[PDB]
Structure formats: C-alpha cells, structure tokens
From a paper:
The K+ uptake system KtrAB is essential for bacterial survival in low K+ environments. The activity of KtrAB is regulated by nucleotides and Na+. The KtrAB system is composed of the transmembrane KtrB dimer, each containing four structurally similar domains (D1~D4) arranged around a four-fold pseudosymmetry axis normal to the cell membrane, and the regulatory KtrA octamer (tetramer of homodimer) with a ring-like structure, known as the RCK gating ring. ATP binding to KtrA octamer activates K+ flux activity of KtrB, whereas ADP binding inactivates it.
Interestingly, the density at this site was still discernable in Structure II, despite the presence of chelators for divalent ions. The density at the intra-dimer interface of BsKtrA (Structure II) appears to be right on the plane of the horizontal C2 symmetry axis parallel to the membrane, along the BsKtrA dimer interface. Structural refinement of Na+ at the site (Structure II) revealed an octahedral coordination geometry with the distances ranging from 2.50 Å to 2.63 Å, which are within the range of Na+ coordination distance of 2.13 Å to 2.76 Å30. The assigned Na+ is coordinated by the carboxylate oxygens of Glu125 residues and the oxygens in the γ-phosphates of ATPs from both BsKtrA protomers in the intra-dimer interface. The side chains of Arg16 residues reveal an energetically unfavorable conformation pointing to Na+ in the close vicinity. Nevertheless, the repulsive force would be compensated by the γ-phosphates of both ATPs and the carboxylate groups of both Glu125 residues. Second, in the ATP-BsKtrAB structure, the square-shaped ATP-BsKtrA octameric ring causes a steric hindrance for the D1M2b helix of BsKtrB, resulting in a helical hairpin conformation. However, the polar interaction between Arg417 and Thr310 is interrupted in the ATP-BsKtrAB structure, where the side chain of Arg417 forms a hydrogen bond with the exposed carbonyl oxygen of Gly87 located at the kink of the discontinuous D1M2 helix. In ATP-BsKtrAB, the bulky side chain of Phe91 flips away from the pore due to the formation of a helical hairpin. ATP-BsKtrA and BsKtrB mixture in the presence of Na+ revealed a uniform species (black arrow), representing a stable assembly of ATP-BsKtrAB complex as demonstrated by the cryo-EM structure (Structure II) collected from the indicated fraction.
Numbering used by the authors:
A (entry chain L), B (entry chain K): 15 to 445
C (entry chain B), E (entry chain D): 7 to 221
D (entry chain H): 7 to 222
Amino acid sequence: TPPQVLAIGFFLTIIIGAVLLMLPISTTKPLSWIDALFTAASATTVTGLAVVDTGTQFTVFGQTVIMGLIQIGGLGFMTFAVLIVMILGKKIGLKERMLVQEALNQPTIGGVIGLVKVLFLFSISIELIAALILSIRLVPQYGWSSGLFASLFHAISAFNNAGFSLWPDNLMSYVGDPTVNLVITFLFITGGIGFTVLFDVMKNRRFKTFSLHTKLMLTGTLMLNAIAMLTVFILEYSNPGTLGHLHIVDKLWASYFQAVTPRTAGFNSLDFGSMREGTIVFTLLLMFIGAGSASTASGIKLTTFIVILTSVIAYLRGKKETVIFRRSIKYPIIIKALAVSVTSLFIVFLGIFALTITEQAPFLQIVFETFSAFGTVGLTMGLTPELTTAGKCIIIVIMFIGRIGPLTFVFSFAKTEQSNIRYPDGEVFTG
Amino acid sequence: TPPQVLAIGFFLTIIIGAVLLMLPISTTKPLSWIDALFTAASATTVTGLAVVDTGTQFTVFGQTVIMGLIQIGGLGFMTFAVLIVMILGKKIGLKERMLVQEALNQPTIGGVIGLVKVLFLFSISIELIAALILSIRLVPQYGWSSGLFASLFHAISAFNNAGFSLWPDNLMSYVGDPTVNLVITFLFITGGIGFTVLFDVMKNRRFKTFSLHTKLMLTGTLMLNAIAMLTVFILEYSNPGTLGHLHIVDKLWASYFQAVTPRTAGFNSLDFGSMREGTIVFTLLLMFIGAGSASTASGIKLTTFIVILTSVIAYLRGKKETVIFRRSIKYPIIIKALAVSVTSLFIVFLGIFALTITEQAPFLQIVFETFSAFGTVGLTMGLTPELTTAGKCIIIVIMFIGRIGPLTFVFSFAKTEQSNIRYPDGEVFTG
Amino acid sequence: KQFAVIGLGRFGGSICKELHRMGHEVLAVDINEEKVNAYASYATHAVIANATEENELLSLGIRNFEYVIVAIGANIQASTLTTLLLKELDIPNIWVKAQNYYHHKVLEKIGADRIIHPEKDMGVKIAQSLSDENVLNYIDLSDEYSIVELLATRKLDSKSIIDLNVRAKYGCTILAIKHHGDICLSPAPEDIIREQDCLVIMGHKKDIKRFENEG
Amino acid sequence: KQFAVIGLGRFGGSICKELHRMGHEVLAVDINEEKVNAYASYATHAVIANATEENELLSLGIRNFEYVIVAIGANIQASTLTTLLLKELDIPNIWVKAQNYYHHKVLEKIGADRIIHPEKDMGVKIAQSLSDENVLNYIDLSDEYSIVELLATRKLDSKSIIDLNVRAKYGCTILAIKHHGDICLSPAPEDIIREQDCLVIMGHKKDIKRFENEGM
Amino acid sequence: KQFAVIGLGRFGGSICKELHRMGHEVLAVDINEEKVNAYASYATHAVIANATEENELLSLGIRNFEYVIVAIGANIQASTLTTLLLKELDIPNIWVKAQNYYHHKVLEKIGADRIIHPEKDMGVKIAQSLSDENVLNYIDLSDEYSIVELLATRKLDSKSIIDLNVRAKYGCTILAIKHHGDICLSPAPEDIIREQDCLVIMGHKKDIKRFENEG
Ligand SMILES: Nc1ncnc2c1ncn2[C@@H]1O[C@H](COP(=O)(O)OP(=O)(O)OP(=O)(O)O)[C@@H](O)[C@H]1O
Ligand SMILES: Nc1ncnc2c1ncn2[C@@H]1O[C@H](COP(=O)(O)OP(=O)(O)OP(=O)(O)O)[C@@H](O)[C@H]1O
Ligand SMILES: Nc1ncnc2c1ncn2[C@@H]1O[C@H](COP(=O)(O)OP(=O)(O)OP(=O)(O)O)[C@@H](O)[C@H]1O
Ligand SMILES: [K+]
Ligand SMILES: [K+]
Ligand code: NA
Ligand code: NA
C-alpha cells in the first residue's frame, strides 16, 4: 500500500498538470491532448523530452506550471506532502512516516522525517544561489524581465535533472561559456549525487567517517565522469559535425559537459544526431546508469551498477563474498540490485520492441529514445518531434515507470506471497 | 587448470584447421589468411558465419575438413579426447575425469565418463539415420556423388547447430518442403536440448521421474518455440519481402522454421535482411538465449534464463526462495546464472562498441551480428561479407568466447582467491 | 497517540492486538522472527530488532512515540537495558512488565513511569475467587472498600431488594443486577432476585463478607 | 484419492513409499529439511512445513485431501495441535499415530477418526511368536477365533490330511499349505504334509493351542 | 607506526578506541562477527578472522605491522598459538594479555616481548585504595619509593606547607596540590592546605604511611 500511494499520487500530478497546460492562458498556440499529456508527463517524471518547444508554445504562466511540475516531480510527491502536513500543524504519524521510507528508498524509518527537512531546505537554497550566479550572465543578454526568469527556470531545471530549456537550442549557444557550464554541471551533479550523500557530507567533513554508500557515490561518480570525458573527447575529436570546428579550450568544455549530462540531466552542447555511432553506444550504457538512490535522477543507480559488477568479479576471482571498501555486502542487497537491473532491461526491451512496431525510424534512434525515456534523461537524436500518437503513449508509460522505479511500479499491483513453507533443493545446470 | 586445458585445446583446433583450409588442395580459389582463420573459427565454434561460400570456395576435401571441425567443435574437445585414450587402452585417471566435468558443466564427477560414451554413440547414430532420411530427397536432385555428400554434410551441420550449407542459398529453396524442414529441425532441437536431457529420456520413459533440469528443458523449449512461432507469423504476415508471397501452408513452415533456428542452428528459410525491425528485436532476445547446458548450442542457456526470471518474479511477489516445479533453487545456482548473464552482456556490449568504431554499417546489422556471433548462431543481415580485416578479428574473438562460455574463458586467466577471512556488513542503497 | 510495544509475548501480543483493534498506530518490536511475522497483520508496523542496542533503537524512530511498552518479563538484563536507553532518549511514558520483587526495584531506580505485574495481579484476583465461589469479579476502590460482582444463591431466589437489609444492617449498596442477560443500572425498591445471576454490590470489604455468609 | 502424510519417520515414510508405489498422489509434510529431501522422490509433493501452524497448513492446500495421516508419535504437543487444526478444517479422515495410553485418550477427545499404535501392535504380534515358535503369522478374527499360519514339525512329516482329526477332535479347519513355494488353496483329502512349511489353520484360539501341543 | 589488535574484548576494544583517537592505523581482528561490526567505526580496518590459522593471518598483511597486540586472556590455546605464528612471522613487537601465572610462563617460553595482566594489576591498585582510603592513585617508582596522590583530611585544613615537617621528619617531598580544580606544580613555602583535595607526595613507601597516620 505505501507503493500504491506513490503510484496513485504521482499519476494524479500528470492529470492535474495536463489540464493546466491545456488551458488557453498557459499556451500561445493550440495544443493537442497528447502533447499536453506528454509535456506534463515529461515534467513530473523530470525527463525533458519535448514534442513542442517550451519557449514558444507556452506563455510565462505556462512555463511557471512547468517549474511547479519539475519541482514537485524532482523532489518527489511525498517530499512536499510532509511539508504541507507540518505547516498545517498536524503531527507525522507512523503510517505517514512509512510512506517517506518507501519514497526515499530508505531501509529504516530512523531519522527520515528530518531528512526531508534538510533536503527541501537545501534544494530551495542552492536553486536560489545558482539563480543569482546565472543572473550575472542572463540579465545583460535578455534584460531584467526575461533574464531573471531564464536563470530561475534553468536553476530549477538543472538541479532537478530535467534538461528543459526555454531557448530553441538547448544550451548549444553556450559551448565555450564557463559561467553556464560550471554552474549548471554543479547543479545536476550535486542534485543527482543523492540526498543521503549530501546529508552525510554536511554533517561529516572527513572522508574516513563517510558511510559505504557515500564513499561509493563520491568515488564512483568521479571515476565514471573521467572515463566518459576521455571516451567522448577521443571519439569525437575528428568528427566534423560535433567537436571538430572548435578550439581546444572549447573541446574540453563540450567533452566535459557531454560526459556528465546523460546522468541524468539531458542538457547538451553538441548535436547528438550528428555524433558517431561509437559515442552513442557508450552513452546508452552511460544513461542506463543513473546517480544516487534518493536523488532527482532515475534509471538503475550507480550503487546498483557497482554492487552487481563487484559481485560478478568476486565470483570470477573465486571470492565467497562481495567486498567494497573493506565492507561485506549481504545477500538482500545483492538480490535487490539483481531485481532492479533485470526488470529495467525487460521494460526497456519492451519499449524498443513496441516502438519498432509503431514508429518508422532508424533503429539507433529508437534505442536511444527508449534508454533516454526510461532513465529520464531527455537526450534526443531527432525522434521525439517525429513520434506518432501511439508512439508518444508508449514513451509516457516508459517515463512513468522509469521515474517511479521498476520495483515500486510492480509492487503496486503485485500481491505479497507470505508463506513459511519450504521445498527440497533441485539441481539445475545454469552453465 | 581444467579451464586452462579447455582454452588451449579449443584454440589449437582453430590453428590446425586454418592451415588445412589454406592448402591449395582444400580450396578452388586463393584464400586470405584471415578468411581461412575466420572459416576455421566459425566451424570449431560451430557458428556458421561465412565470409566465403562453402560450396564454391572449398573442394570436396576442404568441406571434409569443415565436417571434422564441426564434429570436433560441436561435441567438444574433451569428448573425443576420452575416446582416443579409451581406444588406445589407457584407463581414465582422476585428473582426466575432472577435465570432463569442467567440459560438460557437470557439478559432480559421478558417472561422467559413461555420459561421453552415450552422447558420442547417440551422435553418430542419429547423424547416420538423418543422412539416410535426407538421402531419399537429396539424391534425385544432385545425383549419387553429390546427393550423398550433401545429406551427410547437412546432417552433421544441423545436429551440431552449425548452419553451414553447401548451396549458395542457405535452405531458402526448401521453404515449403516438409522433408527438409522436419528432419533438420528435429536435429538441432534434439542436438541442442542437452546431452544430460537426452540421457534422462533414454533411461526414464515417464515425465514424473525426470529431473528438474530435464523438466525445465522440455517445458521451456516447447513454450519458447510456441511464443516465437506466433511472434514471427503475426509480425511477418503482411511483409512483402518475407512470408508475403507464400501460401498459408508455406507460411506455417517458414514461421515454424524461423522460430526454432536462432537457438542456435542459424539455418534460414526467409531473408533476415528484409524482415521488419520488430521481428529482429525479438530474434535478438531469442538468440541471446541458447539451449541446453551440455549440448551443441552456446550463449546463455534456457535454464539460465528461467532461473534468473523466476528469481526476480519470486522477489517481486515477496517470496523468500526460488521455486520451480515445486523444487527450491539454492543460492550457488542463482549466483552462477547471475555471473553468466552479466558477463555475456558485457562481452556483447564490448563487441557492439568495438564494431561501431571499426565497421561502417547500419546499427541494427551490427547488433544482430554481435548477438549471432556470441550465441554461435550464424544468422546474418548482410554484414559478414562486408566486414573489414579488423572487423573480422573482433568476430573471431566473440565466437571463441561464446562457444567456450564466458565463465570458462575468464577462469583461464583469473587466479583463485582463497581467503577464509570475512568483513563487517556495510549498508548500501541499491534502489 | 503513537504506541510502541517491545516484546511480542502473551502479554505484549495482547496489547498490540487490542490497540490495533481500537484504531491506534502500534509499533511491534521483537527479537524473534516468528513472533514478528505472526503479529505483522496485527500491528501498524512490525520490525525485527534488538531493543538493547541503541543503534537499532534509533533506526525505528522510537523518539516519535509517546508511550513505549517494554513487555519483557523473563529477561531482566534485556528489560532493564531497554528502559535505560528509552529513559536516556527522553521517552515521556515508559511502561515495563516486571518479573519479581527485585526486578521491580531495579526498574524503579532507572526511571520506570509504570511497572506492571500481569501474572501477579491475576493470581491474587483468581485466588479471591478460589477462596469464595460466590464472587465473580471485584475491583478494589481502596484497601477497605471494593465493588464485588456476586453470584446469587438459592436462598436469595424470589427475594425483593427491600427484603434484603443490606443498606441498614450490612451497610452495603446494591449496584446492578444482570437478569439473565438483562442489566438494570441502580435498581429501585423493589426488584425480585432470581436464580444464579450476577449481583453487583458495593460496601466495606469486611461488610460484604458478612452478607455472603449470612444473607 | 489424495493422501497427505504429516511427519516422515519410520512409520510415516513407509506410508509415503507404499502409497506412491501403488500410484497415489501423496503429499509429504515434515519439519526436517533432510527428511523432505530424502522422500522428495518417493512422494508426489514434498514440502518443508510446520503442521502446528494454521497459516502454513493452509498454504499446502490441505483442505483438498480426503485422508490426512499425522504420523507423529514422539511429540504429543505437535501431534495433538496438528489434528486440532485438521478437525477445525473439516478433514473427512484423520489417522493419527499415538505414543501411549494417555496420548490415545487426548486424540479421541479432539476428534481422531482412527488412532494407530504401530509399535504396540507389532510388539504383541512378535511376543506371540516368541512364546510359541510354531506360529509364524496370525490374524485375530475375534477375541476367541483366529487364523494362524503354523509351521510343520517333524511328527507331521509324511502325514495325510485325513490322518489329522482337526475337524472332529480339535474342531479346526486346515486352510492352506505352502509346499516349498507351492501354495494350495483349500486342500482336499488327502494331502501329504511335508517338512517345515507354512500350514494355515483356522479355529478357536484355545483349540489351535491344543493342536500345537498334541497334534504338532 | 601500524598497530594490530587481535581480540576485541574489554581490554582489546579499549586499545583500538584509544589508538584510533590519537590518530593511528589500527587493524582490529576478532573471530566474533558482532565484535567486528561494533568496532568497525573505531578502527582503520576491521576483519573477521581466526588468528590461530596461518593462512588467515597472512591474508591480513600482518607482516607489515610493527606492534601486534594479542588481547586474548580467557583462551590459553588461542592465545599461545597466535603468538607462535607471529613469532614465526618475525613480528618485532608482540604484546600478549595473559590469564594466570601458568599462562605467563608459556608465553615467556614461546617469545613474548611483553606480557600484560590488566585485571591483576588493577586488583592490586584497587586493594591499596581499599586498605587506605587516604590514597587515590599511586605509581611505584621502585619497590621502596612511590608517588602517592593523597587526599587532604580535616586536620590538614588551613595548614601551611612550612607547618608540615614532611621534608625533615618524614623525609617526603610535596609535589602538587589540586586546589579545587586548580593545579600548582612544585608549590613554594608556604601554601595553605584546603579541604579534601588531591595532595601529591613523593617519598619512601614506609615514610608516606607514617605521614598518613601521624600528619
Ligand atoms: N532484547 C529483546 N528485544 C526485543 N524483543 C525481545 C528481546 N528479548 C526478548 N524479546 C521477546 O520478547 C517477548 C517476551 O519475552 P519473554 O518470552 O522472555 O517474556 P515473558 O515474561 O515470558 O512473556 P509473556 O509472559 O508476555 O509471554 C518474546 O517474544 C521474546 O522473543
Ligand atoms: N510439527 C511438526 N510438523 C511436521 N512434522 C513434524 C513436526 N514435528 C515433528 N515432525 C516430524 O515428524 C516425524 C516423526 O516424528 P517423530 O520422529 O518425533 O516420531 P516417532 O514416533 O519417533 O516416529 P517413527 O517411529 O515413525 O520414527 C519426524 O521426521 C519429525 O521431524
Ligand atoms: N582465535 C581467536 N582469534 C581471534 N579472536 C579471538 C580468538 N579467540 C577469541 N577471540 C576473541 O578475543 C576477544 C577476547 O577474548 P576473551 O573474551 O576469551 O578473553 P577475556 O580475557 O575474557 O577478555 P577481556 O579483554 O574482555 O578481559 C573476544 O572478543 C573473543 O571473541
Ligand atoms: K532529465
Ligand atoms: K550455428
Ligand atoms: Na518408533
Ligand atoms: Na576480563
């Protein structure tokens, strides 16, 4: 039932958001019922897939609704639910505290209400500061009326890992700009590192006092971004479409930006449709892995990938247990990561299979769209504006399951089987 | 070291076979050093990928070497090694018996020498009978000199799951023929069901006395072929390239043939390059799963797929153990299947990543080639004749690891870590 | 009100089932896996944890519960160490199930708000019914006055309230009569006393015993 | 007929193997993991479960079995609590293995359809063969009449049926003779009695003992 | 300096927490899973291993530690076999916690660099405070001279240092006075002696006892 409240509440925000975006006040042009549903779903799932341009189709009021859906969806439905109850004066019950444990993927209810206070105060603080830093650049280019709103829209979009951009070119005019690159990359890296990871760094200022999850995220993200930066820079160095007609300083900025954006922000500085096939394949594995168990990102998490990878290597080396940072990992942790990865690949496989039946498109664009939609990244190769009515409905389901997580979606309609009986062991050869 | 003997012995058959195929006696045309190595590797790994046509490039003596490599590779290197020792009169030692246990993926050395006697006698018996049944059809079409050799070549090729064909069209002229379809499909289904499964049916004639592995293979193959037959028939019914200009009787034969051929024979009756993208995606999952732990097929096995799939569903339903056919499955079985599937996907991902850098080809053909090479299927979309010199060397490595298995290849160069020490439990969130 | 019950025994499990029936948020904590699975459906939240560990106790959010019941009455070491952590954690109400007289004194020193003896209090009440079969259930208002729900005998059959001089002689007040499933609150003179039904009376402890022997 | 056997012991495991041999659907329930693995191949379905728990008992589909055998004869608490749940679950036939006289009375009160004493019934039958070595196997038709499969002695060698006045004097009827592997049903007068073979007789309990002492 | 502590008990766990507080690399080895988890945060590296096995001991990199502390004092077989492997592995410093007199002799034969009796040394020091309540803590410089931190009595109140003839008569030197939280090193004549504070004195063992009885 705590997974059922998450599924119902998250789906209702799509319906409420779709009505608000379909009003004539919130848009400058007539909008389809599916495009209004797609834009609302792409905001609460915080994906960033846009059939229609955000800057042109929607008004200032319409883009304000987008910021509301991004902020609600990025922090989670139950994050703001506790705040409303706390403001009204009602105390948090045991039943209400169990909903927070399921929403934040916590193993215990110990100190989970206070985590919501920290993560919400940290979210509004760092989005306000980043808007001020972006204000020194966006105001002289777009005045005071549009410059302040563009900084506020992008600071919320970047921190929540959305990828929404008001400009027709999604950050393609700021490839060599260090102000836009450094501030925005600082937002989704810290916004995607995990609320528990941020809470541990705030209270503990020494690396040896960090938990296993905090040390895994800090070391894992640094290693994964370094490999991704080298892979993009080497493969795209001679590419004429992207990273070719740029200076060496501008090559380092775009390679660094494209290394960290697929997890899971979905901003860009180079056209992904003109990249080589080798970089797209590496991006597929890059955006299949997310960042942070309790964060604004989606897909399988970085800790999930490390736990599975170390468990296989330990088996290949003959070790009897999974040991990371001189800490043993128990069997329930292994089987949960096994359940996340297999269910995620099964849903992605069904999405690719369903889109190939419906959409008439190159196969590389179909696979790129499905991995981006499931990971809630939003990177496109040129397929989202070309999707049919049936194709868009598949992506909405993929984005919905990807943000909520494959386990919580299944647990909504999977009745628990509580039996204490056992069975004799059977031998089956799995070579 | 028993995995090391398998890796060294299997690689030496590639080198010996390459020299024999490169002789002027065995070929009608000059042959490249890489094409001779590719053809030799595609035969001992029993894959069927042909850069050159087998019927035209090689002589009768050259095709006899192909039959030798298929027979040695299909039954395994250590299968014939025991026969040579037994014929010479030397008794099988404990060290020699441990090599058979590793080669056949057996958990115990109990009655493993007698299994080699049964599987070798069954192999030569059913290939001789199937050659006689195919002789009543191949002799009136190709005379006595070529008709008898074509039946003998194809009976060995089909039983060992090779897909090699002497004709330029790989069984594309026998779409509506029930004699070719029924006999050949009976060969790789029974040749791929597993030597342990065949041994259990021979000694036990009642289904309730079968083991868990035998019941999994018989029920799993019947269900998987039924789903594949329905998927191919529905998707390709309106396709003009394949299954469109055929009678309803001929549609059932080609749909049934294409349902069972990707696991892992690689024969065909329809052109895979003209099929829709939806059927190719389903074939990718179809040929990623093989058939039988100790058989002539490769890739991850059907029991490996069922064990992982049931373990996830049991976790999603809240069950504390994996139960198939009222039999519990222990943790060492689960982790071995986990190691097979993750390592297989990692090697396939590296193969796709390496081929995209080297080969200039559509992305769907690259992924289809890598899954077919790793599963030792041999189905092509039109890429194998177009491979470069560097591209062919990648496929040879992929075919080599796929036939030997990802676990046995890693265990060759992975030193065992035997430590009895343990570590304190660490909590890591893998949501 | 949020309630936490530590120890799912015969006494602890009865509190969880009764409070969940009335519609309260109950946390069931036990060290035994089978006890937690049995009471998982009878509690709002059931956790397998050791209450003697501070790290495990803080993982339950135990600081959010006003009432914590430590229903461990056979392990003095587990019971006393649990309430020491709760007293250190500033729990407003700690109710502990004790074992004997010495266990009662240790809990009083380490700050137990209420100490309960379930078996000892029932053993005294049962022995009162064993000594005198006329009584059924009694409540001690004080050390000298009590309300006793008596059982009507054969000599009290077909007798009116005014016939019984309980008010004048014995100095006792008849409170209620359970006439074969029918209950009359504060009967007025006069009501006929029937066969062996529940007769609720109120008076001095020595005065009620005189009514049982004589009246 | 669907049979459920609870407790895979020496007595419980013999019922599972015998019923599975005859071709019946047998459910084997035991709390011990090693017992279930040994009898997994000798039963249609083998489950590791505790029969004293109602939740575990309902997970087995125990309401679909007409005959449930509780073969627990060393744990009175486990045996009596198991049959209480089955009686509450409306099992048509409950057969319980008892331990002693007091265990027999508890099961009779809580509704046992049949109570079995395997060791006690064999101990009486074995002691009858110990007291008299002439008998081999007997069946009590009543408290005064029984069919006893006797063993031929040396004095009965080369003797005809008509020579033995069992019908007139002892009032007993000779039923069958197992002549060295050859079995004759209802022998006719006269048949020669050979060496130490099985001689099946029928008569009064006191009358057969007179034949053993005098005739045999 | 790299330290290894084998056995996380009351004595072993105190060494791990104290050395980690001072900023040293400490390896905590114990055969009990619960002990290792508790001291995982109080040690640089905590491993669940058996120290009596040479294969498990070599897996820890135990040859890289200059100081290895075998804090096992209730299992003589486990304690003596552990130090035999370490002596065979050429550990420069092996400190062993002993149990009794016979355990002390076995460790001396098999090459223990230092043998420690934690409970025996504290029992002697505690019994010295039990016999004489005037002393608080003492250190034996030799078998006849010691530094005793005495407690001021009522007769020493409002008394100057020059008034006390400790130097001439008793032959003892007053070292320090802990004046209600204020500590004076080497007091000069004269300082007023207040109420029951710590009085540090130095002298012969028999001479200090005369000062306690008389002065
Ligand atoms: N440290 C502990 N933490 C949590 N639960 C515990 C702990 N120790 C014991 N328990 C559980 O508390 C319950 C009650 O304890 P126990 O059976 O020892 O007491 P009791 O006085 O005999 O109980 P009762 O009379 O209520 O049946 C049991 O289910 C036991 O498993
Ligand atoms: N509650 C229970 N539920 C199911 N099986 C049980 C239960 N308790 C015991 N058993 C199993 O029942 C079997 C028979 O019980 P037990 O061995 O105590 O009786 P027994 O009279 O000695 O048996 P036998 O003479 O047939 O060997 C054992 O294998 C035991 O593990
Ligand atoms: N072979 C061993 N290897 C490693 N650790 C061990 C071994 N044997 C015992 N220990 C651990 O060493 C610790 C101290 O040993 P033990 O408790 O027997 O001694 P002790 O003298 O009673 O302890 P303490 O330091 O509390 O006085 C315990 O935590 C025990 O589990
Ligand atoms: K995004
Ligand atoms: K093949
Ligand atoms: Na017995
Ligand atoms: Na001690």
